[PDB]
């Protein structure tokens, strides 16, 4: 009973703070909590992590990651598990993009600085810009799905706050274009990008970065929920 809008099922992708298809580019010293993976690209497309594969052929380690690094060219079970994960990313993406009967349509005509986002399903038939702080407000069990037919841009220093008990694990952002999060910004939620997700210097996120191209980082704090 209660809110009718169902969660997006991430499948095995839920086990990653970052998952992409073509690569992960890191510069400076990031602090990632949770696992990171890339498929079908190989581990050579994970750059900047000081990656060491000294003990397992199934994973690698980095001083920047409280977690493990997985790539398509590692040994069993990693390739098959990454293919599954990526396939579940795709499914989740389509699942988020395909919800109907939105509660909010073209809120702010595509620029939502200063708004309080109450629960439910949001659609923009355009790029979405977040140039000033926003609040996501609702219960600890409520769901938000944000459908973006364009890029998702959040400005430097912008903070997404959570009111009422809203949780990051229950928030999903689906973007047909790239996501770009500005220096020192703070984001909340799962991001399902059809292309890239790019964070700039000292930005932070509580959530997941699931990109169907590449993710780029610059001294970011990325923390998987729970």
| Other residues' Cβ atoms within 10 Å of the Cβ of residue 111 | 17
CB 191 within 8 A of CB 1: no
CA 37 and chain centroid, separation: 13
CA 172 and chain centroid, separation: 8
Method: X-ray
| CA count, 13 A, side-chain hemisphere, 27 | 6
Beta bridge partner(s), residue 107 = none
Instruction: Tell me which residue has tokens 């500005």.
Output: 182
Q: Mention every residue, 6+ apart, whose C-beta is less than 8 A from residue 81.
A: 12, 70
Nearest one of 108, 126, 113, 96 to 182, comparing CA atoms: 113
Phi, psi for residue 85 in degrees, rounded to 5: -55, -50
CB 66 within 8 A of CB 33: yes
Query: What tokens does 16 get?
Result: 């990653």
Q: H/E/C letters for each residue in the chain?
A: CCCCCCCCCCHHHHHEEEEECCEEEEECCCEEECEEEECCCCHHHEECCCCECCCCCCCEECCCEECCEEECCCCCCHHHHHHHHHHHHHHHHHHHHCCCCCCEECHHHHECCCCEECCEEEEECCCEEECCCEEEECCCCCCEEEEECCCEEECCCCEEEEECCCCHHHEEEEECCCEEECCCCEEEEEEEECCCEEECCCCEEEEEEEECCEEEEECCEEECCC
Query: What tokens does 82 get?
Result: 């990454």
| Spatial separation of the C-alpha atoms in residues 154 and 160, rounded to whole Å | 10
CB 212 within 8 A of CB 191: no
CB 182 within 8 A of CB 165: no
Strands 35-38 and 69-71: parallel
CB 222 within 8 A of CB 203: no
Q: Mention every residue, 6+ apart, whose C-beta is less than 8 A from residue 41.
A: 20, 21, 22, 23, 71, 72
| Other residues' Cβ atoms within 10 Å of the Cβ of residue 57 | 11
């Amino acid at each position: 009973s209660g809110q009718t809008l169902d969660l997006v099922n991430l499948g095995v992708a839920a086990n990653f703070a970052i998952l992409s298809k073509t690569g992960i580019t890191d510069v400076y010293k990031s602090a990632i909590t949770g696992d990171i993976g890339v498929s079908p690209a190989a581990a050579t497309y994970i750059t900047g992590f000081g990656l060491t594969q000294d003990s397992s052929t199934t994973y690698a380690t980095s001083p920047q990651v409280t977690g493990l690094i997985y790539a398509a060219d590692y040994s069993t079970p990693t390739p098959s598990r990454l293919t599954t994960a990526v396939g579940d990313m795709q499914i989740a993406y389509d699942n988020a993009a395909g919800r109907l009967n939105p509660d909010f349509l073209n809120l702010g005509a595509g620029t939502i600085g200063g708004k309080t986002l109450t629960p439910g399903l949001y659609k923009w038939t355009s790029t979405l810009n977040i140039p000033t702080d926003i609040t996501i407000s609702g219960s600890s069990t409520d769901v938000w799905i944000f459908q973006v037919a364009g890029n998702l841009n959040m400005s430097s220093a912008v903070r997404i706050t959570l009111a009422g008990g809203a949780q990051a694990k229950n928030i999903f952002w689906q973007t047909a274009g790239a996501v770009t999060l500005g220096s020192t910004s703070h984001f909340e939620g799962n991001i399902l990008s059809q292309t890239g997700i790019n964070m700039k210097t000292a930005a932070s996120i509580n959530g997941r970065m699931m990109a169907q191209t590449a993710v780029t980082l610059q001294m970011n704090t990325v923390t998987i929920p729970q």
